[PDB]
Amino acid sequence: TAYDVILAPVLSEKAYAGFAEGKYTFWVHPKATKTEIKNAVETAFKVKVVKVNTLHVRGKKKRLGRYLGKRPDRKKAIVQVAPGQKIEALEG
């Protein structure tokens, strides 16, 4: 119950654009989302996170019913000045 926080890297133009500097966001855990997911990502990608931000989401979809995904909380960790590493050049 220590990694079940970071879920998947997010992938959108906006997502990648981030790489430039302040890292990108990964879909985190709805709750326990605690912006304190810093000593969470830095224990997985081994780095210094200097700032965190968070959001929410998921829409509907049709046919016979509705309601999509969840309402995933999610958002970018800034990472120290320069250490920005791994997964960067990966996928673009």
Next chain:
RNA sequence: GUAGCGGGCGUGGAUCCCUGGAUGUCCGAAUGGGGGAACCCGGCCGGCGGGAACGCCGGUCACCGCGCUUGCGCGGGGGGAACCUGGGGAACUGAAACAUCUCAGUACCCAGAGGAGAGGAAAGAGAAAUCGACUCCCUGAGUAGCGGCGAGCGAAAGGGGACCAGCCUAAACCGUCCGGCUUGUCCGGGCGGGGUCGGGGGCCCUCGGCCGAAUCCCCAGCCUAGCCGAAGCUGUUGGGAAGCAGCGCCAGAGAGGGUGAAAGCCCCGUAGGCGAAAGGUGGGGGGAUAGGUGAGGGUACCCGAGUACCCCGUGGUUCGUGGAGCCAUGGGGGAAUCUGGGCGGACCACCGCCUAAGGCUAAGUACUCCGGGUGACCGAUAGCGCACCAGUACCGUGAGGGAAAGG
């Protein structure tokens, strides 16, 4: 739930089916506190990240009722289709108006009980040299009665059946521990022993002989998966044989469904017969604890109190004020302990019945959320509101209303 990629696992016995276990976010009796259910915020102990601020992680903290010196240990709370008991408790209607009466102690509301609930071992019944807890059914009986004697309401005993079961206490009397007091060989609180009645029990002397749980146990048996199960070929028309035609065969199995059309013998089955490591259940038959086991003779110590009883006000019963008891009981008065007290329809007197004011008690009875089996039951405008992704869509602030649609 198939359709698809994309990957994989199985006789090294998968998937599946039964049994037990594990994990089980958050809200909900909801129980750390809050709150606009599913969210927000905290105490205390411990552990994570460099961790002091921050943040996660695991425990743990509601309140109420009973029993031990302060902490504790047992319990409660909410839900459930009906069925059940109690506490409250209508009107429409009927009376061809309406007020008594009726509907009706019904509808509903509330509390509570549980696989049932209730009731239950006589202060009974009622005329029988009588009967012998209670409940249920059939009668008795639309009788007896009740009733603006209208409308209408309506027993009980007795007789058939189902079931079958009986039991503890309070008080005399003895012992013991404790805290109060007028430090009196006394008062009452708690345990133990005794004692449970149509007549008995206590206490003194005289004579001493066993049945049996409603509670604990064990196995059977029965649920909760399964396994075995007989007997048919050829030809022929047909899109398709189970039809038709010719020879058979099984049968404790000729119930049923299914297979391209109408099959006992093709498939699943059916008759019949086997199966449980595990968990439920389980006197039906048996083991063991609990507990219970006699007869006379004497005092004249006990036998359930604001009770009986009488009176005023009411309720229940067939009983509506009636000649109106009995059973309940709000108010007032207020006893006795077997030379006691209640009842047998005012009241007396006879004659007889029964032992009030403490409690428990199986079964036979009721119901159908749930599982199975049948139907001179429906077959999609029917049958449940739903055969289908329905208490949905849609409607309504809300309570609530509530479809259509199968091949």
Next chain:
RNA sequence: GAGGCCCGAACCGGUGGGGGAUGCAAACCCCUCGGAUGAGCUGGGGCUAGGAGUGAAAAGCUAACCGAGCCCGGAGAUAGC
């Protein structure tokens, strides 16, 4: 520089007329009108209920028909029509 003062926007209202009448609308539009520092208007948060509430009082209002709301139930009320 006073005022239940005056004219007049906003804002509140609803006088008269026309139109509308299977409407733009289950009360509307146009012109014209009343009030407009007050017994004013208005947002937000609260409280009062069915023989009851509220009512500067019309039996008015209480979720588009109120001389007794709506829903479910008694219920297949009763109907000499």
Next chain:
RNA sequence: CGCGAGGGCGGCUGGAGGUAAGGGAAGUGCGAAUGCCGGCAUGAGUAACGAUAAAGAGGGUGAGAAUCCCUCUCGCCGUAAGCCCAAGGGUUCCUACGCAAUGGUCGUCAGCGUAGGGUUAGGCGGGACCUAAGGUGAAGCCGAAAGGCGUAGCCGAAGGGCAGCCGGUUAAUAUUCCGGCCCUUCCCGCAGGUGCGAUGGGGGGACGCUCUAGGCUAGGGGGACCGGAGCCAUGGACGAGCCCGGCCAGAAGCGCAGGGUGGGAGGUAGGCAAAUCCGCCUCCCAACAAGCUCUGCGUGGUGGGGAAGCCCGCAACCCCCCGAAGCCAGGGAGCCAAGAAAAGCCUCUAAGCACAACCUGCGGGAACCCGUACCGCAAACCGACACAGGUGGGCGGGUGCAAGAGCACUCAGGCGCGCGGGAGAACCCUCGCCAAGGAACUCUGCAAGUUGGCCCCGUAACUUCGGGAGAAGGGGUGCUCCCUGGGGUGAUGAGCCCCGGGGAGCCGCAGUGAACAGGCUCUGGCGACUGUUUACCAAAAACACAGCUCUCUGCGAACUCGUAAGAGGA
């Protein structure tokens, strides 16, 4: 073949059930119940297509367009028909594909269909802060059960309280991301200082309406001045022309406006005796201040932004004037109806502790949860609809008119209302005009007209004396030129605005030349008056109203609600 209800036969269709004689059972026979459910008709190619703000054309794309994109014209809003915020709504946001249906037409389009994106906060708004009404509710009171009151406590906001301004970024977010400048809390270490220390005491927080002063700022108007690519048209103008732009934020420190506040020194029956803190008494000084505090505004190191202009892309920033409803703010004056609470915040001592703890500094650190798309006077909310209706707050430019949020035109910005095309009848709606006459109309001058603003004359009865008063009834208003009186800021002189006054003279039918914009009088009834009322036929002479009278009520009041407790009265 049966009298008939029906019963057989035959032919096409259909493709899997059916059911004799003779009998038995019923949910057993439909044309009507304004029956119920479904389907389909008639009216009918008829009415309508939802505001009379308005359209046209050229290019594009495309199977196909009046209806989609682009361009140029025209028109309509402009206290909006424009921007920003709440609520509510929940992806309607942006992008790529699409048109069956949904759009009252069309559809290449969309708020529609499929898919993928998008919402980033210590300082914004909420919560780990405060209380209001009122809820809830340990105790406690009361009720047949449900349950009713209710102390403390808790909950409860648009009210109190608390630290971010200016730019830049994306298709879609931004006070959230980025830059610049500026802050707030917690924690730790260090240095230097003090009696430290509450849920308890005190102060404070802290308040009405109307009217107002002085300074500011927002906002807006000028310029002969600053810098500008440029343009001379159509008769003239090479002009001190025309045209565009002439700011924003910003610490400490400076200035300018304010708001707060007496300083002492002793006593003390109070603040549930604990305070050297309040509160009260006493007396040296002091006083329409100073000082000390605390705001706002300028200024500020500095950063930011920066048009019109052709090809397809150039770099100032000053000077006056008007000027708030906003700010300094808890300012002032006046009045009667006499105008929240609590916390944060100061201060005072208690327990306890002083090796704690606080206070100021400086450095390092730490800083969670929720909201953030988009619509938002509307086609995204409430009205069954893409409904001419309903919906709280802020901003809301310019000129002109006495003023203004009015009226007319117009900036920015946004719209031309999701059917069109022709005709050019009756009739209907809405609108303009009319000879002569002027209420003859009609229930009625209903309706429509006339009048309309401002300045100056001038105005009766009656009166409660305020008022009848805009009584009535008149005259003036435009434009040019001349002289002249005071004002505000400058500075006392100049521009700049602000109110006047006096003479001439010009033109038209007409000078508030358009739009906003009273017709009046005499006399009765009723009701004093402003008010209120039947949401959706009655706005009144009805209700109310100050005011008068009768009457109940001595306080555990009477009276009302409730079974009661209890509450209202108060």
